[PDB]
Design brief:
- 2 copies of one chain form a homodimer.
- Chain A is α+β, with helices and mostly antiparallel strands and about 300 residues long.
- The first copy, chain A, has 3 domains: about 110 residues, Trypsin-like serine proteases (Thrombin, subunit H), CATH 2.40.10; about 80 residues, Trypsin-like serine proteases (Thrombin, subunit H, Beta Barrel); about 100 residues, Orthogonal Bundle (main proteinase (3clpro) structure, domain 3), CATH 1.10.1840.10.
- The first copy, chain A, is about 20% helix and about 25% strand.
- Chain A has 8 helices and 13 strands.
- In chain A, strands 5-4-1-2-3-7-6 form a 7-stranded antiparallel sheet, with no helix packed on it. In chain A, strands 8, 9, 10, 11, 12 and 13 form a 6-stranded mixed sheet that branches.
- Chains A and B meet through strand 9 and strand 10 of A and strand 9 and strand 10 of B.
- The complex binds the ligand *[C@H](O)[C@H](C[C@@H]1CCNC1=O)NC(=O)[C@H](CC(C)C)NC(=O)OCc1ccccc1 (2 copies), chloride ion (6 copies) and magnesium ion (2 copies).
C-alpha cells in the first residue's frame, strides 16, 4: 500500500535526449528515428527576443548552424524545417535507441512525467498535471527548454509536452510535439500572464478514493448530495463543475471501494465547507488535484 | 525556477532489474556484473513465514531452484549464497548494461530515488527519505520486494535500499545492499511496529531556503534566536534538535540567500508557534522535511 506522486521510468526517453546548439544558444532536443525536435527559439538572436521573425531567422540558417550532440558524438544535420513552435532537424543517423512512440495532445487535468534536462543530459524526473489555465508547476532553469513530458503504455512512449518558458508567477508553458502551445502563450518575451486557475474536481475525488483504498478514511461521511447540489458548492470554492463523464471515469474507483461517486462528492463537500480539522489525507494538509482517476488505478493496482 | 519532489533518471537502474523466482514466490533482483541480489525471503515456504530458518532453507536449494529472468531471456544461476537478509545469485553472464556503482548505507533524513518494480519490469520512480524511525513512506504492493533505492553522482550509481516489507501503519522497511535492515526490523511476519517518528529539522530548514530562493517569502521574520532557544521549541513540536553540523551543511543555502541559519530558525520558530495562517509554502500546507540541503542546492542550481 501507500500513495506517492509517481513518475514513469525515464530510461526509454533518456536514450532520446540530445543537445542542440545554434550560436551562443544551447538547449535539449528529442532524437526519434532520423529526426531531432527542439524549441524553435533556439535560433533567436539575443536582441530579437521581443518579437522574433522565426520564418526570416530560419531561412538565414544552414544545416551547419545547428550542432546536434549525443554524448561525445556529433549527429549530422542534413535539413532544417519548422512546425509551429518546434524546429525539426533531419540527421543522417537514426536513433538506435528509438522506442515505439506516438505524439499526443493532452487535456487540462491530465498528468505526464517530465524528464528535466540540461545540455542534453537527463537531470531528474517528476510528475506534472496540465492546469485548467494551461500551465504546469514544474521545476526548470536556463538550459531546460526541450525537456519533454511523456506517458508510457506497454512499450510505447506518448510524448505530450516540450518545455519553452517561465511565466512571472513561477509557472511553466510549452507545446505538444507538433509545436502548438498549451494555452494562449507565444514563444517571445512579450508580457504574458497565466490566467486564473481552478481545482481539478475529478482528480481531487480520485485522490480521496486513493485515501480510502490506503485506509485514510476519517473524512468519509454518510450524507446525500446531487450533481447539481455538489456543483453549487464546487463553483463557490473555485472547483470545476463535475460532469457526467467525470462521474463515469471514477466508476473503477467507485466499484473497488463500494462508495458511490455522489457519496464521495458529499464527503468532498463537507471538507470544502468545514476544512480538514488540522489533519492530513495521504500526508497532505490540502486537497491534491494532480492525480487522475487513471493515476490512482495504476498505483493502487501496480 | 520552481521546486518539485524530484527523482533521478532511472535508466541506468532499469537496465539492472531482473525477475527472481523460487517456487511459487516471485520478486525483483538487481543484476550487477556477474551477480543478482534479491531479498532472501524469496526462498521462504508458505507456512514457514512466522520464523523461517534461512540457513536451513537455503542449503535445501540448488542453483536450479532459482529462475532469473531478464526480459524473454533466462540468465544461468551457477551459485546460491546469503549475506544478512539478501541472497546473491552468481550467473554465467555479466550484465552488459552494468554501470559504475557503489553500495552505501544512508543516514536518517537522507533521500534516495525508488524504482518500484513488479516481475522484474520497472513500473514507476519516486523520491523517499529515510525517516528517523528507520522506515520510508513509499508505495509498494505484492511483487515489489527487490525494488531498489539509489542516488547518482556523475555516471556512478549509489544503491542504498532494497525493499522487503510493509508495517501495519502503511510504512515500508528494507535493508542496504549488504542485506542489513535499516531500523530494528526482521524479514519474518512476527508482529513489528514502526517506532515513534520525528520531523527532520535540517530538511525543513533546507526547504524553507528553497522557498526563499523561489520567491516564497511571506513567513520570513527578522527575529533573533539561538541554537539552544530554537531547540527548546524544536523538542516541544517533535522536531530533532539542530546540531552544529546541521547548521554547517545549510552554509551553501545561507550564503546564496543572505539569510543566516539562525535567522531562518527564528522564522521556523514563529511558523511552529503561530502556524501557517491557512497559507502554503511551495504549494504545501505543512512543513516538508523530505528534502536534504543537497536536494535543494541540486534542484535550485540544475
Ligand atoms: C529555455 O531553456 C528557457 C527556460 C526558462 C527560463 C528559466 N526557466 C525556464 O523555464 N526559455 C526561456 O528563457 C524563454 C525564452 C523565450 C524565447 C520564449 N523566456 C522566458 O522564459 O521568459 C519570457 C517572458 C517575459 C515576460 C513576460 C512573460 C514571459
Ligand atoms: C515483497 O514483495 C513483499 C511486499 C510487501 C507486501 C505488500 N506491500 C509490501 O511492501 N514483502 C512481504 O510481503 C513481507 C514478507 C516477509 C517474509 C518479510 N510481509 C509483510 O510485508 O508483512 C509482515 C508483517 C506482519 C505483521 C506485523 C509486521 C509485519
Ligand atoms: Cl506520431
Ligand atoms: Cl543524474
Ligand atoms: Cl514526482
Ligand atoms: Cl561496492
Ligand atoms: Cl512503465
Ligand atoms: Cl517523486
Ligand atoms: Mg519551415
Ligand atoms: Mg550462505
Amino acid at each position: 500500500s501507500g500513495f506517492r506522486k509517481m513518475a514513469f521510468p525515464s530510461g526509454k526517453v533518456e536514450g532520446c535526449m540530445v543537445q542542440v546548439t545554434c550560436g551562443t544558444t544551447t538547449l535539449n532536443g528529442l532524437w526519434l528515428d532520423d529526426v531531432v525536435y527542439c524549441p524553435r527559439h533556439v535560433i533567436c538572436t539575443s536582441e530579437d527576443m521581443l518579437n522574433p521573425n522565426y520564418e526570416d531567422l530560419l531561412i538565414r540558417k544552414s544545416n551547419h548552424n545547428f550542432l546536434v550532440q549525443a554524448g561525445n558524438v556529433q549527429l549530422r544535420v542534413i535539413g532544417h524545417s519548422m512546425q509551429n513552435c518546434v524546429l525539426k532537424l533531419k540527421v543522417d543517423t537514426a536513433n538506435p535507441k528509438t522506442p515505439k512512440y506516438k505524439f499526443v495532445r493532452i487535456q487540462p487535468g491530465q498528468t505526464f512525467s517530465v524528464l528535466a534536462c540540461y545540455n542534453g543530459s537527463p537531470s531528474g524526473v517528476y510528475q506534472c498535471a496540465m492546469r485548467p489555465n494551461f500551465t504546469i508547476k514544474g521545476s526548470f532553469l536556463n538550459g531546460s527548454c526541450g525537456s519533454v513530458g511523456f506517458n508510457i503504455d506497454y512499450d510505447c512512449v506518448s510524448f505530450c509536452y516540450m518545455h519553452h518558458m517561465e511565466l512571472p508567477t513561477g509557472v511553466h508553458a510549452g507545446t505538444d510535439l507538433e509545436g502548438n502551445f498549451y494555452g494562449p502563450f507565444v514563444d517571445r518575451q512579450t508580457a504574458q500572464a497565466a490566467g486564473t486557475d481552478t481545482t481539478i474536481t475529478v482528480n481531487v475525488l480520485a485522490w480521496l478514493y486513493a485515501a480510502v483504498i490506503n485506509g485514510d478514511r476519517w473524512f468519509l461521511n454518510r450524507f446525500t448530495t446531487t450533481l447539481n447540489d455538489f456543483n453549487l458548492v464546487a463553483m463557490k470554492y473555485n472547483y470545476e463543475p463535475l460532469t457526467q463523464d467525470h462521474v463515469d471515469i471514477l466508476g473503477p474507483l467507485s466499484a473497488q471501494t463500494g462508495i458511490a461517486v455522489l457519496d464521495m462528492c458529499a464527503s468532498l463537500k463537507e471538507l470544502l465547507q468545514n476544512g480538514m480539522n488540522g489533519r492530513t489525507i495521504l500526508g497532505s494538509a490540502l486537497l491534491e488535484d494532480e492525480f487522475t482517476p487513471f493515476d490512482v488505478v495504476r498505483q493502487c493496482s501496480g
